[PDB]
Design a protein around this ligand. Structure first.
Ligand SMILES: N[C@@H](Cc1c[nH]c2ccccc12)C(=O)O
Ligand SMILES: N[C@@H](Cc1c[nH]c2ccccc12)C(=O)O
Ligand SMILES: N[C@@H](Cc1c[nH]c2ccccc12)C(=O)O
Ligand SMILES: N[C@@H](Cc1c[nH]c2ccccc12)C(=O)O
Ligand SMILES: N[C@@H](Cc1c[nH]c2ccccc12)C(=O)O
Ligand SMILES: N[C@@H](Cc1c[nH]c2ccccc12)C(=O)O
Ligand SMILES: N[C@@H](Cc1c[nH]c2ccccc12)C(=O)O
Ligand SMILES: N[C@@H](Cc1c[nH]c2ccccc12)C(=O)O
Ligand SMILES: N[C@@H](Cc1c[nH]c2ccccc12)C(=O)O
Ligand SMILES: N[C@@H](Cc1c[nH]c2ccccc12)C(=O)O
Ligand SMILES: N[C@@H](Cc1c[nH]c2ccccc12)C(=O)O
Ligand SMILES: N[C@@H](Cc1c[nH]c2ccccc12)C(=O)O
Lengths: 66, 73, 69, 66, 73, 69, 66, 69, 73, 73, 69, 66
């Protein structure tokens, strides 16, 4: 399955998983402090991922930094 | 399964999921504040995605950037 | 590549993106209005086998771009 | 499935679906006025598409404009 | 499933579908007037397609243009 | 790539495109006549496992071109 | 399935199908006269093809001419 | 491409590579400590659907490199 | 299913099919005279092919030409 | 099924297989002396591999060389 | 790519190409002798999971060439 | 399945197959003398291969020589 790479560029970045299915709510928020990296898949439970805070992000479509 | 990457370039960008099926309504609107990013898949429940507000958008087909670049890729 | 979609960015107000029914019959089942700079990323689906766009729009598909509309 | 992109370059372009199966007749004609775009799949019901009028057409094989 | 793109460059171009099976007959002839386009698939019923008349033709294998370009691609 | 086909353009009158039967036996089952500039796009099929072309023709297959015949 | 393209460069070229299975014998010989083309698949009945006479041959591996 | 993995090389002592549980709940199930120059090649699996790395590390995934950490 | 192309560059080139299974024997030797070509598949019965005699050989892995070119491809 | 190539550049390089499942322990450590090579797959039993010691490592994602090159590929 | 094979051209007399048995046990099951310029195109199979070549040979596999032996 | 190519660059190179499954032990060691080549698959019984001695090795990931 597809995955996303997120590197926090400041303290307190949040990577938030939104629930798969008819209903949509946040099911988990992972905090990242400056420099820390999360590599996260889309899954049975997660069909959208929201990133809050300054981050460098890689997906299959390329890079987004800031 | 395809996904879209959306970066908000203003506050209050709305990423709107429309229902898969005979009927089309929005089932969810996810708000993004400036600089926030949403990576959203098409799914059993969402077969079209509408973005309202200045956004930088990447899909498999390329990049669309409000008031900026539009490039096939 | 087991599902495809179209990207539509409105270049003026009042753009419409219209889904045509899959099957023996062909009728408009939904028209989605876009104002200037709004983006619709829409799949072909069990219910939609053709998409019509009216108004000035920038469109991306697997086949490339059609712009300045 | 394969799809075709058609942009009308004048008013009154017609995109016509021809029926799949042993019999061949037109089952639908979609009118396009100048500048309007139809993105149409091949389907269970449509195995050939005919375009009448001045159009810019994209398929997997490339572009045909005029 | 393969398809062919045919553009008529004169009136009365005939795109002829021949029957899939032990026997070969034409089951349909679709007439194109000049500048009209037919995008036709091979199918359960059509296993060969004959084009009579000046036409610009694209397939997976390339382009054939009456009195013009023939290019592999 | 789950089915293949051959493109044959006649460069003179009286070109023949001939299908040979699939199976233990091999016989001509159909000859299709092409006049100058006529095009045949023909698949390999349940019934046709070899194709013979006689006369001057431009031919395209997955393997490339054979022309000036 | 794979196929071979053979163009006869002189009269009397023979394209010969050899039988698939434990036994190997010629099951068919197609004669080609100068300029004629045979496009032949590997099949249930044919697992090797022999070309006799001057020919220009294309396969997935490239061209052999002479 | 029916399974993916991440390569993590520690650029300092005390790097941690942390697996997050697959499923409705998300919790750290294992933290693997790496000292300077140690390498972990770790798959996504039935039990691990997200990986967190803390500390200075060079990382390779299918999407490319993230370094100087 | 892979195949090999063999062109004989002398008379009496032997293309030898060896048996698929626990045991290895030649089950067939096809003789090629100079300039003849054999396009032979691996099959349920043939899991190795030996060529004896000057030959130009193409496979998926490249070209081997007796007293000439050897090239990966 | 992915595999990793590990070349030891000192004695006593340890290639450590960690267990596939809810629990993570090392089930095996294969020692390599300088210049020895291990080509190891991920498997039903091994879902992560740890390398301790100076090593030249190749995977699908590229090359990592202790005190040397790191290159995506 | 659902089956692979190796190409071996002997560059001297007495080259041997040796098949090693697939399964729990590993033993030579066949040695095929090649004289100078003879070519063997040999698959991996239900019975052969490793191939040993002794003597001077030019070899092609999916991974490239190994020559001047 | 994947395979490895090993060419011995000195006498007495050993190519060692390690067992697939929960247990890991050497199940076979093939000796190669200078210049000899082993082309070895990963299999039901072999999920890791160890090479001892000076060798030129090719895999899908490239070459390692020395
Ligand atoms: N338990 C979550 C873990 C996860 C994967 N990707 C995520 C993205 C954001 C938050 C959590 C996750 C799941 O399997 O779905
Ligand atoms: N619960 C929604 C989450 C979602 C995915 N993509 C979206 C796009 C827009 C809005 C919501 C979503 C679903 O699985 O479909
Ligand atoms: N309910 C519609 C939503 C949709 C998808 N693609 C569209 C294109 C145009 C209009 C509506 C749509 C469907 O699933 O088919
Ligand atoms: N109801 C038609 C819609 C359609 C798809 N492609 C077309 C091309 C032309 C006309 C109509 C169509 C169908 O599903 O087949
Ligand atoms: N009813 C025909 C339509 C068709 C498809 N391709 C064609 C080419 C030529 C003529 C007719 C056709 C069929 O499904 O086969
Ligand atoms: N009825 C023939 C039509 C055909 C396809 N390809 C051909 C090539 C040559 C002659 C006839 C054909 C068939 O289905 O097999
Ligand atoms: N009846 C033969 C036709 C054929 C295909 N390829 C050939 C090559 C040579 C001779 C005959 C053939 C078969 O289906 O196998
Ligand atoms: N009857 C043999 C024909 C054959 C195919 N490839 C070969 C190579 C060499 C000799 C014979 C063959 C078989 O099907 O296996
Ligand atoms: N009977 C052997 C033939 C063979 C194929 N590849 C080989 C390599 C070496 C020696 C023999 C072979 C087999 O099917 O396995
Ligand atoms: N037992 C864990 C091992 C593992 C794989 N990838 C990981 C990443 C981080 C931590 C542990 C792991 C699992 O199979 O899931
Ligand atoms: N009998 C062993 C043969 C083998 C394949 N690859 C190897 C690598 C090393 C040692 C032996 C082997 C097996 O099938 O697994
Ligand atoms: N018996 C182990 C062998 C193994 C494969 N890859 C490894 C990596 C490290 C240590 C051991 C291994 C297994 O099949 O999983």
């Amino acid at each position: 399955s597809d995955f996303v790479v997120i590197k926090a560029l400041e303290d307190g970045v949040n990577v938030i998983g939104l629930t798969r299915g008819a209903d949509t709510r946040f099911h988990h928020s992972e905090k990242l402090d400056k420099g820390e990296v999360l590599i996260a898949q889309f899954t049975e439970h997660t069909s959208a991922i929201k990133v809050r805070g300054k981050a460098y992000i890689q997906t299959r479509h390329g890079v987004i930094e800031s």
